[PDB]
């Protein structure tokens, strides 16, 4: 079992050990000073790895002094392992919180910024508060990212050398960090290196659901209303149209009416894009479309119509604000709720780190997933002292009452013997149910229902001592330790001889992993302990995932009340049920990660092409590129497409971005598509020269960024929410052999081209059409 991987690793610790004595003589400052010595050496030569022995050795004595926690080889091996970029499988109570110190320090010497992710706020704040004396003492700084944290403070934390926090906030922050307008609000920093505590939990387990930021539609609510009232008051002269090419615009009569109606007196400018966009689809919905032709009004809602059948294309909603507009138009309750803006799985958010790593107590079994996703290599480490415990069997039953009384009675029994027990549950109500019998009978205990992880954290530590009964859910008091004695050497041996801590799990969990975690809370290093599972036939995991066996047994009749069950075949069935929800879950992540890849490739560019604008990167060759793009398109459409519809081609460009009287070109019949476009484009290069010369190349470029970036946001968020609705729409399909994913990709590919186009034709319009 990973013998040589650990053996070679052992050579590293072997060296760390020889060094120890030399540093022993050193003062507190002779040690801090070393952080610098380190940094400077890194510039002169040596790799982070070439430093490893001394680096960790320095964390050893500094740790060995400010917290007492000197480090044990296993805690060193694991330290090296995190730095090597893998998983550090150590069992509960093995000291993982400290296995991290040595590795952060080492990597934090680059000034880049290390990341330590935990399962929750408390776990992170506590983790940082504990090891900070080691970090601080060595000339480094630490910060932790907690929930509802103001931007000002939040910035400072990533600024610090080391940073801790809930997995939810790191990936969350990021979203806002890339979703934000200017940089006065970006909060993150370079995602360089991360250490994931309880890696199986965040990565493998959470994976199932993605992170999603949404937005409260207060603004939009009365916005379509105002726009719709105005478009309503508007006259035929206030706008011009063309149902032939499905376009419409607001004439000069409208610009002023809008400025007079609203308090906005400028319009057309990037500042206002909003009122303008809204009044736009408000107008289009009012005249370009019509009742019973385009869209239809059934009951209290407005459904869309398909042109290929005349049927109602249900499920699908109108694009970029349109439906919301038609709704306002007719006079029906508007769907203004849950706006999905940001979204991301941990499968990818974590892929975004130069060097990934983590620790846990159960991962080598899921290695194939950890590697073929995060290319995380699980390396198992030996436990410090030999692990002696009693991982007892699964007391099998039928009927929850039978299972429950068996549990209640076995607890009164262990309790009198004087030993503590840990009753693991998997529901706040089940924990209360099991609680009722104990109270009904008269035996003291406390309920840890994962809500105030800190208050409960204290409770579980004490739980580990003398006559205590603690019923915790599978998420209550996690990183806390079960010290036999609760801090006393007296109760330590008393409870040590009595046979450790006892663990009883209500039902078999969703995986062997979660179960061994209840089993793991006991028997650390060198402590006796027992753990047993009181299972029953109606427990869902078996009830639904068991098979034909549990069914007939459950159906039969009734006989031996309170009498437990057994059989070879019975167990053979109980295990398939768990490995069945194991595989069920294996594939739910598969069909969540892929659906994200599609949006991840998109979100990838929309983001780079968003960051260009922010870090003052030149966008002139690119805007000009898309400007040419619009025209090359006009080419295939009217130029070549229909045949040579000059009136249309020109209407399209006047429609799109060209001014009023400009594209006048001789030749036409004598000239070819390309030449005609080269001309239309030179005519455009001139239009921009008029702009630069009359505005100043600087405002011209400065303005280039103001509107490119602004329209991306408007059309991107809407493309995202809509890409989600697209997924929901595939649900009502299947066909002969049409993969539900395949369709989603195609209808998502062109949907991306439509989005990008809505940007091409929009940056330019604002950049040329009016000024
Ligand atoms: N080398 C050590 N010497 C003394 N105490 C130690 C040492 N290492 C860890 N501890 C103690 O062990 C307890 C912490 O164990 P943890 O770090 O929680 O182990 P773990 O359960 O693997 O970690 P989590 O829950 O993934 S942080 C604390 O009471 C520490 O004081």
Residue numbers in the entry: 1 to 771
What does the paper behind this entry write?
The crystal of the CDSecA2 and ATP-γ-S complex diffracted considerably worse than the apo structure with a notable anisotropic component. Correspondingly, its structure was less well resolved. Nevertheless, the electron density map for the ATP-γ-S ligand unambiguously positioned it in the active site. The structures of apo CDSecA2 and CDSecA2-ATP-γ-S complex were very similar as they aligned with RMSD 0.85 Å. Binding of ATP-γ-S did not lead to any considerable conformational change such as opening of the PPXD. Crystal packing of CDSecA2 requires contacts between PPXD of one and NBD1 and NBD2 of the adjacent SecA2 molecule, therefore larger conformational changes of PPXD would disrupt the crystal lattice. As evident from the CDSecA2-ATP-γ-S complex structure, the highly conserved residues involved in ATP binding and hydrolysis were positioned within Walker motifs A and B at the interface of NBD1 and NBD2, and are present in all SecA homologues, including CDSecA1 and CDSecA2. As in another SecA the opposite side of the gamma phosphate moiety of ATP-γ-S contains the conserved lysine (K106) in Walker motif A in both SecA1 and SecA2 in C. difficile, and the mutation of this lysine is lethal, suggesting its essential role of both systems. From the CDSecA2 structure with the bound nucleotide and residue conservation in structural alignments, we thought that the requirements for ATP binding and hydrolysis were likely similar to those of other SecA ATPases.
SecA is a cytosolic ATPase composed of multiple domains that undergo a series of conformational changes associated with the domain movement during the cycles of ATP binding and hydrolysis in the sequential translocation of the target protein through the SecY channel. C. difficile SecA2 (CDSecA2) is involved in the export of the cell wall proteins (Cwps) that compose the outermost layer of C. difficile, the S-layer. We therefore determined two crystal structures of the CDSecA2 protein (apo and in complex with adenosine-5′-(γ-thio)-triphosphate (ATP-γ-S)). Crystal structures show that CDSecA2 has a fold similar to its homologues, with multidomain organization consisting of NBD1, NBD2, PPXD, HSD and HWD, but lacks CTT.
